[PDB]
Amino acid sequence: ASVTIVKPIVYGNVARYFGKKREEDGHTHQWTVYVKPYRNEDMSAYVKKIQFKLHESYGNPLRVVTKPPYEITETGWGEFEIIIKIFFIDPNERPVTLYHLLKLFQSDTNAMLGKKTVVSEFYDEMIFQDPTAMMQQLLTT
């Protein structure tokens, strides 16, 4: 490739326990799943939208976020895999797919260190090889 652009990202989730099981629906946790840049940039320059596919137990399980922050906050009772798909401003630039296990329950290791939220997050890089002129400009602004 003549131009290679690497965009580091962090994705995953945070979760917080209610201290009790809610009577109405059995929900125990609030959680937020997200994708963010690793560096301080405006990702929307080159990201068109990010889609998050939730478990079928959720209403409207295919969620779309079109502007930063690219996050979904929900409540629930169970862990499950979320599929994340990142679309670019050039429709012909192949979207990126990420796989994340939504984490609710804290390790004893972290509990004993006084952590009161669960954070499960992962570093990755999106790699663009010879993107269009328009994409190159927006990736480098």
Binding site: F88, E93, V96, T97, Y99, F122, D124, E125, M126, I127
Partner: peptide, 11 residues
């Protein structure tokens, strides 16, 4: 675009 990491196993 492609990613650095595989789908379900990461460095």
């Amino acid at each position: 675009a492609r990613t650095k990491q595989t789908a379900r196993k990461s460095t």
